[PDB]
Design a protein around this ligand. Structure first.
Ligand SMILES: [Mn+2]
Ligand SMILES: [Mn+2]
Lengths: 260, 264
């Protein structure tokens, strides 16, 4: 199942080229600030999936073409990112850096400095958990998303800029991915293919990243783990379009705009 | 004014040795998960300050000894910490602490079991942000500051993971609103382990001053109400062991004591 926020924090299920509105069904308030609707849906999902599946045929269906998809989790407890982590410790990204699949990456105006793209699989945590054993990893994974880990090349602050952590376009629930350790990932800048890899090539694997993170910190429903980027990290400029596709997880494209 | 969470996310005003429950008048829901009640109170405070002042005479007052004070903001958008940042004579820029590290004034610091390694205390003034804001000019700093709390920036000495363990960011015991601190750049701060005074300083000795730390953080990131800025620690950083008690006092801001306990 593919869960998405759209048009001001409405919750939907993505079915083909359409999205069905589950806002009223789930009792989510899109005017809630801070918006924690998707984190509550994630915590309660094993109790609501059946209801969503049983009621879908009655729900309002809008074409994807007619809505503004947003970042699925806008105020996570934390964003944990693994540096490197592909065959040829973790750091934190601020929630404030999150942006959705229709928001531009805004470059800070740093002449003598480049902004690089990083294509990553995101893990969305589904359970409050500490010291998760490797063998138990699937119990605490809600699903997966595409993530761009944008960085000013040279310091925590150079990964911290607003728009430097695009996540989207939806969460694919964990049950809809056969084996997250065999996913093809690809990133284009315009028509140029810059990054291509398989999550089989992860150095510290998904169970290891969850076990490592949970040994230090209580994880929460909504937490994002950025699993790393392969080779082909390179620059973006005003007018570029970054495309990321992860097999079975999803696909998104964002514009790059120079900041004023 | 001193704003507190207690007894599972109830909101209170601290009056001398008592607290008054303001949960109903603020429309807070203590059962809400995630608990964002103090963030909403902070965003709306200039509209609700009058309402709280007017009600105080009518509200029942519980002795502080009879409640459990909690961390005032349990799920901030971010925690921004400035490394070092005191003159000894009275780094990679700011870093981020996970919200998961937050602890209250009645919670113990739990030492991870690291033979060969020590856990150190760091006494710091915390700034609580009051406004959604980006690229704040030094001269407008006062517009975006809600208030102040005491913060312990605990670390395994040697790496981000080293500042990230659960209970390695005690904050409390309440927020003191910015109008109740005449000048936050003149505050005396002390930290004790048991009867031993380890850290003594004044915020007049900050290398990057309060306005600088807000302009710096806000140039990179959109700040949110409830955001915590850890302003740095002076000299006297040192170890804590099972059975230690850490007391932090900051003049005009607050004081808290926590127990230290060896983890499983
Ligand atoms: Mn990365
Ligand atoms: Mn510190």
């Amino acid at each position: 199942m593919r869960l998405a926020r759209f048009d001001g924090g409405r919750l939907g299920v993505v079915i083909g080229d359409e999205i069905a509105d589950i806002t009223a069904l789930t009792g989510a308030d899109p005017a809630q600030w801070p918006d924690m609707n998707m984190i509550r849906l994630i915590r309660d999902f094993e109790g609501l999936r059946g209801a969503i599946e049983a009621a879908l045929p009655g729900l309002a269906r809008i074409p994807l073409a007619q809505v503004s998809l947003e970042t699925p989790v806008p105020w996570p407890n934390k964003i944990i990112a693994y540096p490197v982590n592909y065959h040829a410790g973790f750091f934190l990204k601020p929630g404030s850096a999150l942006s959705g699949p229709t928001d531009p990456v805004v470059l800070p105006a740093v002449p003598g400095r480049e902004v690089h793209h990083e294509s990553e699989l995101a893990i969305i945590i589904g359970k409050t958990c500490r010291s998760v054993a490797r063998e138990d990893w699937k119990d605490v994974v809600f699903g997966y998303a595409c993530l761009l880990d944008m960085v000013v090349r040279g310091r925590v602050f150079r990964k911290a800029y607003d728009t430097f952590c695009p996540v989207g376009p939806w969460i694919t629930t964990a049950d809809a991915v056969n084996d997250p350790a065999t996913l093809d990932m690809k990133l284009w800048v315009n028509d140029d293919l810059r990054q291509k890899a398989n999550t089989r090539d992860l150095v510290l694997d998904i169970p290891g990243m969850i076990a490592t993170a949970s040994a230090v910190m209580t994880l929460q429903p909504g937490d994002i783990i950025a699993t790393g980027t392969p080779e082909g990290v390179g620059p973006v400029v005003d007018g570029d379009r970054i495309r990321i596709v992860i097999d079975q997880v999803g696909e998104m494209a964002v514009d790059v705009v120079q900041g004023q």
